[PDB]
DNA sequence: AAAACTATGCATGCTCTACTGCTTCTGATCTAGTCGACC
């Protein structure tokens, strides 16, 4: 169920996506709303940041994360 | 006729109880955006 997470069916929908991830990963990390990594997770499309990838939210979270997790 | 004791009025401070104005908290409303799933 977590390798072919597409054919789950017991669980309902998270109800979060990319977007309410980011807010959620902001308010929990306790992230300045206001700062770059903030802005980055927010809007992961905009290739502003000119490093790493700038389409993945998945490697973004990780680079954020990279210093703060064991 | 002179001196001592007492009554009543008034000043004085402190303490306690309503009323007005400023600041903050909550509720209610509206507007904007996200997500599930279909096609």
Same mark, same amino acid.
């Given at each position: 169920?977590?390798?072919?997470?597409? /054919?789950?069916?017991? @669980?309902?929908?998270? #109800?979060?996506?990319?977007?309410?991830?980011?807010?959620?990963? %902001?308010?929990?990390?306790?992230?300045?709303?206001?700062?770059?990594?903030?802005?980055? /997770?927010?809007?992961? @499309?905009?290739?502003? #940041?000119?490093?790493?990838?700038?389409?993945?939210?998945?490697? %973004?979270?990780?680079?954020?994360?990279?210093?703060?997790?064991?």
């Amino acid at each position: 169920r977590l390798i072919l997470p597409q /054919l789950e069916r017991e @669980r309902m929908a998270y #109800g979060i996506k990319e977007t309410m991830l980011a807010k959620l990963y %902001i308010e929990l990390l306790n992230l300045p709303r206001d700062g770059k990594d903030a802005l980055k /997770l927010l809007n992961y @499309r905009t290739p502003t #940041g000119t490093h790493g990838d700038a389409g993945d939210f998945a490697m %973004i979270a990780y680079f954020v994360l990279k210093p703060r997790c064991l």
